[PDB]
Design a protein around this ligand. Sequence first.
Ligand SMILES: Nc1nc2c(ncn2[C@@H]2O[C@H](COP(=O)(O)OP(=O)(O)O)[C@@H](O)[C@H]2O)c(=O)[nH]1
Ligand SMILES: Nc1nc2c(ncn2[C@@H]2O[C@H](COP(=O)(O)OP(=O)(O)O)[C@@H](O)[C@H]2O)c(=O)[nH]1
Lengths: 244, 244
Amino acid sequence: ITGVRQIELWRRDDLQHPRLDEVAEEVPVALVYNGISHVVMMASPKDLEYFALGFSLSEGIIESPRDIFGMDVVPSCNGLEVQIELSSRRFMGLKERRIGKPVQPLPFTQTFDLNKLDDALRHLNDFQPVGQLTGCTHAAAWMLPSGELVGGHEDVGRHVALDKLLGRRSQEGESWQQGAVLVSSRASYEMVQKSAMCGVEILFAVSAATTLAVEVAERCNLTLVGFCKPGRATVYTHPQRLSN
Amino acid sequence: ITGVRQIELWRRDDLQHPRLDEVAEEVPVALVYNGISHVVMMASPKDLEYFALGFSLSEGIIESPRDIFGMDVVPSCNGLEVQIELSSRRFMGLKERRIGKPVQPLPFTQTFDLNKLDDALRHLNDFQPVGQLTGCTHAAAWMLPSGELVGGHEDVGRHVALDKLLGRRSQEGESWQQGAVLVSSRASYEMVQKSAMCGVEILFAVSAATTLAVEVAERCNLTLVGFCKPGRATVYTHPQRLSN
Ligand SMILES: Nc1nc2c(ncn2[C@@H]2O[C@H](COP(=O)(O)OP(=O)(O)O)[C@@H](O)[C@H]2O)c(=O)[nH]1
Ligand SMILES: Nc1nc2c(ncn2[C@@H]2O[C@H](COP(=O)(O)OP(=O)(O)O)[C@@H](O)[C@H]2O)c(=O)[nH]1
């Protein structure tokens, strides 16, 4: 199963007999826009096309996925590269800025009944096969106003995991939209910045948030909920969008 | 209390009456070597001198803390900068490489009785005042062969937290050394790379590790233990150094 490796190790009790357990892969991945290596991110070695797409929108390197005319995932020395053919307009924009594109306040369009949230919380797992085996993954899911988790993606690192989902949803155009993002991690200012960039109005994080995170969500008109556990949830910003 | 902010929010049950809770600060900090901004890292707004030092050794920007002739922490727009005066030799080395210094296999010098570990596990908390209040911190502690936690530092992000401890220990010269590092997080390849750089032979991580992490620890002769919880611990590499 992709992302997982069977490794030899020792339990604290038996330093003389090695055992096997599954460990999660963490390959370095490089996003290469028109030959220029923009970033190397450690990632689970799957859903890289989605990651590449997601990351492009997230960081505001593109406005549309139509801004990309090619994507090939290639092996390298360290690990993997996603070779991305990019609009001259957007490439120059990236060269120039040398992310930081502007965020821009969100509209109020989305609603969410917090009663539908618990069920979604119990199903985040369904998108972490390696997390399940391994304990080393985070996931990011898209949840419709219904509460239904339409799809989701895991990763060794929470941001890459979010980027992948953002990429996913970027490709499910229309039928998705609406809804919210569910994330297994803590919510960091960059996570909310990315979400907002991609038109996400509500973000549910399973753990804590930072001062800066909530401050950013205020100026973005993004609705930030943290400590989302079955029976709990704490909203830091723009509660206007949620019901009981 | 530094690092903490009292913020207004809403519990899932009461979207009409705001309450207060403590949230953790996440200021952007820039490490500025001789006027050149090398990195911006999000961090808890304390122990920045230690962070700056730690990070320098970690990344191999310096060999000794004697390589630094000045450190001033200054406020800015985003947040904070640590202005670092650096050896011409080491500065040029950093300019040139434009981390990646060589790691170099560790010697076998350290031992640890896993029986002394549980107690240390119960005391990691003692180094997260904001973690305690907030749930948003990670910590990195130095544990002597004794099992005694001599000191420790928390942060919003695990790496910065480790860097801070590495900085700390870099300043406790001699009396520390020996021992091991205890970390509240998952162990990532960069965490082990940093530790090794600073002469740490044993690393205890409270959570999972990645394929790459353990692979790196093999070539570094670093002893990597993960899933360290009271009564548990799982060693991925060089068990030679530990007893039962
Ligand atoms: N393969 C494997 N998985 C583990 C082991 N120990 C724990 N896990 C899984 O990984 C997760 C550990 O995450 P942890 O650091 O304990 O955070 P926590 O789950 O919130 O306590 C757990 O949810 C377990 O399902 C282990 O020894 N091997
Ligand atoms: N200030 C504050 N702290 C919390 C709240 N909920 C949980 N915490 C603390 O933050 C931690 C939450 O981390 P969590 O994401 O649940 O990981 P876990 O502790 O392994 O389950 C807990 O250890 C709590 O001590 C809250 O609503 N407010």
